[PDB]
Amino acid sequence: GSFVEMVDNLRGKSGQGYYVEMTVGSPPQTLNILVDTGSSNFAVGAAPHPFLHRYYQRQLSSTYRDLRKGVYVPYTQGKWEGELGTDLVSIPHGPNVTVRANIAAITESDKFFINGSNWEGILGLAYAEIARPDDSLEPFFDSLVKQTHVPNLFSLQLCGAGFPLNQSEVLASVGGSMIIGGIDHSLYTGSLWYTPIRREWYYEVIIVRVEINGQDLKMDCKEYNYDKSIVDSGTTNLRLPKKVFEAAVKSIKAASSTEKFPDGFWLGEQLVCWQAGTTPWNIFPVISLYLMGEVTNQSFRITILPQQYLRPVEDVATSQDDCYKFAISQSSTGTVMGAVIMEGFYVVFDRARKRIGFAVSACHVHDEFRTAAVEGPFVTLDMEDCGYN
Amino acid sequence: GSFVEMVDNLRGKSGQGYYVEMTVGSPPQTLNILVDTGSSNFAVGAAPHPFLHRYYQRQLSSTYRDLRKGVYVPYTQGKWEGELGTDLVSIPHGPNVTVRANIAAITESDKFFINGSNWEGILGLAYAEIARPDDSLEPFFDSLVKQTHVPNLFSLQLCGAGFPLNQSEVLASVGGSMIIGGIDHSLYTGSLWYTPIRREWYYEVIIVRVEINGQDLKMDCKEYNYDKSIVDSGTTNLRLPKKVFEAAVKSIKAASSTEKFPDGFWLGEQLVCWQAGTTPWNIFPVISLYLMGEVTNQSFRITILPQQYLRPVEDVATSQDDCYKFAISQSSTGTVMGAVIMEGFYVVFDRARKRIGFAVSACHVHDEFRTAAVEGPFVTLDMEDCGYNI
Numbered sequence: 001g002s003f004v005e006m007v008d009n010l011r012g013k014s015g016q017g018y019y020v021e022m023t024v025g026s027p028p029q030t031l032n033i034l035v036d037t038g039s040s041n042f043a044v045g046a047a048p049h050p051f052l053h054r055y056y057q058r059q060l061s062s063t064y065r066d067l068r069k070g071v072y073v074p075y076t077q078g079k080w081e082g083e084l085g086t087d088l089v090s091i092p093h094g095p096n097v098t099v100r101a102n103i104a105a106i107t108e109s110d111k112f113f114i115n116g117s118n119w120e121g122i123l124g125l126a127y128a129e130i131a132r133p134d135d136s137l138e139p140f141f142d143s144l145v146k147q148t149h150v151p152n153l154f155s156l157q158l159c160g161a162g163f164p165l166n167q168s169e170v171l172a173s174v175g176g177s178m179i180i181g182g183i184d185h186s187l188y189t190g191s192l193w194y195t196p197i198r199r200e201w202y203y204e205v206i207i208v209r210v211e212i213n214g215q216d217l218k219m220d221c222k223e224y225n226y227d228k229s230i231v232d233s234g235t236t237n238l239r240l241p242k243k244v245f246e247a248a249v250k251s252i253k254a255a256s257s258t259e260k261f262p263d264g265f266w267l268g269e270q271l272v273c274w275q276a277g278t279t280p281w282n283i284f285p286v287i288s289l290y291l292m293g294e295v296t297n298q299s300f301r302i303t304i305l306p307q308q309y310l311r312p313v314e315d316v317a318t319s320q321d322d323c324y325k326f327a328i329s330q331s332s333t334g335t336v337m338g339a340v341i342m343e344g345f346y347v348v349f350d351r352a353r354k355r356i357g358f359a360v361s362a363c364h365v366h367d368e369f370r371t372a373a374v375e376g377p378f379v380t381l382d383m384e385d386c387g388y389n
Numbered sequence: 390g391s392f393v394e395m396v397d398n399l400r401g402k403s404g405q406g407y408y409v410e411m412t413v414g415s416p417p418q419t420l421n422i423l424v425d426t427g428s429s430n431f432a433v434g435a436a437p438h439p440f441l442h443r444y445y446q447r448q449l450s451s452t453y454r455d456l457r458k459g460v461y462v463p464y465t466q467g468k469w470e471g472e473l474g475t476d477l478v479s480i481p482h483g484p485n486v487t488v489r490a491n492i493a494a495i496t497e498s499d500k501f502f503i504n505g506s507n508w509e510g511i512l513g514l515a516y517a518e519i520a521r522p523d524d525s526l527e528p529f530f531d532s533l534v535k536q537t538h539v540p541n542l543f544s545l546q547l548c549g550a551g552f553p554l555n556q557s558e559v560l561a562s563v564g565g566s567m568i569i570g571g572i573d574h575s576l577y578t579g580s581l582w583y584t585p586i587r588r589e590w591y592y593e594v595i596i597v598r599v600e601i602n603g604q605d606l607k608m609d610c611k612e613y614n615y616d617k618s619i620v621d622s623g624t625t626n627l628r629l630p631k632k633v634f635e636a637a638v639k640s641i642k643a644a645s646s647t648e649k650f651p652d653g654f655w656l657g658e659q660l661v662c663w664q665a666g667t668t669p670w671n672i673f674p675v676i677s678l679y680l681m682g683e684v685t686n687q688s689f690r691i692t693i694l695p696q697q698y699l700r701p702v703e704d705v706a707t708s709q710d711d712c713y714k715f716a717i718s719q720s721s722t723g724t725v726m727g728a729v730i731m732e733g734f735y736v737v738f739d740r741a742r743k744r745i746g747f748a749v750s751a752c753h754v755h756d757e758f759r760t761a762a763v764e765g766p767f768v769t770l771d772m773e774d775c776g777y778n779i
C-alpha cells in the first residue's frame with residue numbers, strides 16, 4: 001500500500017514530458033528517460049545531438065550485446081532511427097532489480113529530442129503488438145516482469161505545477177511518481193474506478209459519453225473512439241478525432257462566450273494571458289469523459305477542469321501575467337488522453353487484470369470552487385457499440 | 390551561339406575545380422584562376438608554393454598599386470592570408486576589356502592550393518556582402534560592370550567528362566565555358582527556367598520540394614534551405630543539411646537496394662568500381678530539386694542523374710574498371726549545389742534581374758535511357774515559408 005522508495009521519482013512537465021532516471025550498461029551509465037505509455041520501444045540517444053549533454057556509449061559497456069539489426073520508429077510527430085542491442089538496465093528509484101532488456105541506440109533523429117527537457121531516451125510502456133520492428137522485440141516492462149517477481153502493474157501520478165516552471169525550477173521540482181509493481185494510497189483521494197483495456201496494444205479504452213459542463217456533446221459514441229482511444233503520457237494534449245474536436249470546441253466556446261479569444265488560441269498555437277491571479281477559471285467549463293466500467297451496462301466518469309486543459313506557459317515578455325495555451329487538439333488517429341488529462345488523476349495500468357484505474361490525484365490543480373472527480377456508477381447501454389472496428 | 394570567343398574557355402574537373410585564364414599587371418602576367426560562385430574575393434598566389442609553378446609578381450607590374458592592408462579568408466575548408474592591392478586585369482578568352490580590380494596577393498595558405506589543379510588563384514564571383522575584410526572591397530565582377538559596358542550577367546557551363554582524365558588529358562581537354570556578359574544558346578537544349586536570387590550575398594536560392602526517383606522526400610521545405618541554399622562552383626559535391634542528407638541517403642539506398650555498398654561509399658570517402666562499361670546506372674535514382682519560380686505559386690524542377698552525383702575517379706590500381714565516389718555530402722552550413730550538380734546544367738547568373746536560370750547542359754553526361762532535365766511549371770504554395778530566417 002506504500003512504496004516510499006518510488007514516490008516522487010519523476011520530474012518534468014506536460015509540455016516536455018515526464019521522465020524517470022535509469023541506468024544502462026556496466027559500469028552503469030545514468031540517463032533520464034521519458035515515461036511513455038503511448039509506445040513500446042525502449043530507446044536512448046547513442047550519439048551526439050545538440051539537445052543532449054549525455055548519451056549511451058555502447059563501447060563503454062561490458063554487458064552490451066549487439067543484435068546487428070536496425071530499427072526505425074516514426075511517432076505521431078517525431079521519429080528516430082537506431083541500432084538494436086541488449087544490456088543490463090536498472091531504475092535507481094524503482095524496484096531493487098536489474099533486467100536485461102532490448103535497447104534501441106538512437107543514431108539519427110528528427111524532432112524527437114526536446115531542447116531543455118533533460119531526458120535522453122524514451123521508455124515505451126505499451127504492448128509488444130506495437131513495438132518496432134515487430135512484436136518479437138520484447139518491451140521493457142515485459143522483460144521486467146518475466147525476469148523478476150515484480151507484479152505486472154505500474155501506476156502514474158503526473159503532477160502539473162499549475163504555473164510555469166523555469167529552467168532551474170523544473171530541474172529541481174518533483175514532477176510526480178511512477179510506482180512500479182503497485183499502488184501507493186498516498187497519491188490519490190477517493191475511490192479508484194476501472195475501465196477495461198479493450199485490447200493489449202496501446203492502452204486502449206472506450207469512451208461512452210462526453211459532457212461539457214454537464215451538457216451532453218450528443219454524438220454517436222463510436223465517434224469518440226474513432227479509430228481508437230488511448231491513455232498516453234507521451235503526448236501533451238487531449239487529442240480528439242476531427243468531428244469530436246469540432247463539436248467540443250464549439251461547446252467550450254459557447255460556455256466561455258463572455259470572453260472572446262483569437263482563432264490561434266483555439267488552434268492550440270497561441271497563448272492567452274491575464275493579469276496575475278485573475279485567470280477567469282469559472283467562465284471555462286469542466287469536461288467529463290465517461291468510460292466503460294468493469295460491470296455490464298455500467299460506466300463511470302472522470303471530470304477535468306480548465307486547470308487541466310489550459311496549459312501554463314511563460315509569457316513572451318516574461319511578464320507577471322498568468323498565461324496558457326489551449327491543450328486540446330484535433331487528431332486523425334483517434335482520441336489521445338494525454339499528459340494534461342493524466343495530471344488530474346492517479347492512473348493505474350493494471351496489466352495483470354487488463355484494466356486501467358483512475359482516481360482523483362492528490363496533486364491535481366484546482367480552485368476553491370471546483371475539483372477534478374472520478375465518479376460512478378452510471379447505467380449505460382450497448383457500450384461495446386462505442387468501440388470502433 | 391553568339392559568344393564564340395568565350396565558348397570552351399574553361400578547363401579542369403569537379404574534384405579540382407574549373408578555371409579560366411586571366412592576366413594581371415603590366416606587362417600582363419598569365420595565371421589560371423578558379424571560377425568560384427561561392428565566394429567574393431579575387432586572390433592569386435603571390436609567393437612560391439610547392440603546388441604552384443607560377444605566381445603574381447607585383448614588383449614586375451608597373452600598374453600595381455599597394456593598398457597597404459592585409460586580408461585573411463577562411464573558406465568552408467582551406468584558408469589563405471594575403472596583401473591587398475589593385476592592378477589591371479583581363480580575360481584572354483573573355484570580353485575584350487581591361488579593368489582595374491582589387492587583388493589579394495596570397496603570401497601564406499593552408500590546404501588551399503591543390504596539387505595538379507593547374508590553377509594559381511581564385512575568382513570569387515558572388516556579392517560584396519561576403520567579401521573579406523568587408524563589403525567595401527569591391528568584387529571583380531562589380532568592377533568589371535562598373536568600368537565597362539559588359540552586361541551584369543555571366544553564365545557557366547561546367548563539363549564533366551563522365552570518366553577519369555589523367556594529368557595530360559585534363560590539361561588538354563575543354564572543361565566548359567564561362568560566358569561573361571551574356572547567354573550562349575549553343576550551350577544548352579530545351580528552355581531556361583529562372584529561380585529568384587533570394588538575397589545578394591551568396592547566390593542564394595530556395596528549394597521547395599525534393600524527389601528521389603519521383604518519390605517525395607517529404608520534409609518541411611524549410612529543412613532543405615537550413616540555413617541557406619546556394620549555387621557554388623567552388624565546391625565539388627552537392628552538400629545537404631544534416632537531416633536532409635540522412636533522409637536522402639536513406640532513400641537513395643532504398644532505390645539502389647539491389648546492390649549493397651559499404652558505409653565508406655555513402656560517406657563519400659571510398660570509391661566503388663565496376664568492370665569496364667558495366668556501371669549499373671539504372672539502379673541509381675534520379676534526384677529532382679524543385680526551385681521557386683518567378684511567378685507566384687509556381688515552381689520548376691531540375692533533375693540530375695547518377696552520372697552527375699557519382700564522380701568518376703581513377704582506380705587505386707589504375708585498372709580498367711570504371712570507378713566513382715558518391716558526390717553528395719552532409720553540410721552544417723546549408724545546401725550547396727556544387728560542381729557535380731552544375732555539370733548537368735547551363736547556369737545563368739542573371740545579376741541584372743536578380744535571378745538564376747537553369748537549362749539542360751549540351752555537355753551533361755547521360756545514357757540512352759535517361760537524361761538530365763529542367764521542367765515546369767508546377768503549382769507550389771507558400772514557397773516563401775521554405776526560406777530560413779535566423
Ligand SMILES: CCCN(CCC)C(=O)c1cc(C)cc(C(=O)N[C@@H](Cc2cc(F)cc(F)c2)[C@H](O)[C@H]2CN(Cc3ccccc3)CCN2)c1
Nearest residue numbers: 015016017038039075076077078079111112130234235236
Ligand atoms: C511536440 C513534441 C512532443 N510532444 C510534447 C512532449 C510530450 C507532444 O505533445 C506530442 C504531440 C503529438 C502530435 C504527437 C506526439 C507523439 O507522437 N508522442 C509519442 C511519444 C513522443 C514523445 C516526445 F516527447 C517526442 C516524440 F517524438 C515522441 C507517443 O508514443 C505517441 C506515438 N504514436 C505513434 C506510434 C504508434 C505505435 C508505436 C509507436 C508510435 C501513438 C500514440 N503515442 C507527442
Ligand SMILES: CCCN(CCC)C(=O)c1cc(C)cc(C(=O)N[C@@H](Cc2cc(F)cc(F)c2)[C@H](O)[C@H]2CN(Cc3ccccc3)CCN2)c1
Nearest residue numbers: 404405406427428464465466467500501519623624625626
Ligand atoms: C577539398 C578541396 C576543395 N574542394 C575540391 C575542389 C573544388 C571541395 O570540393 C570543397 C569542399 C568543402 C567541404 C569546402 C570547399 C570550399 O570551402 N570551397 C570554397 C572555394 C574553395 C575552392 C578550393 F578549390 C579550395 C578552397 F580552399 C576553397 C567556396 O568559396 C565556399 C566557401 N564557403 C565559406 C565562405 C563564406 C563567405 C566568404 C568566403 C568563404 C562558402 C561556400 N563557398 C570546397
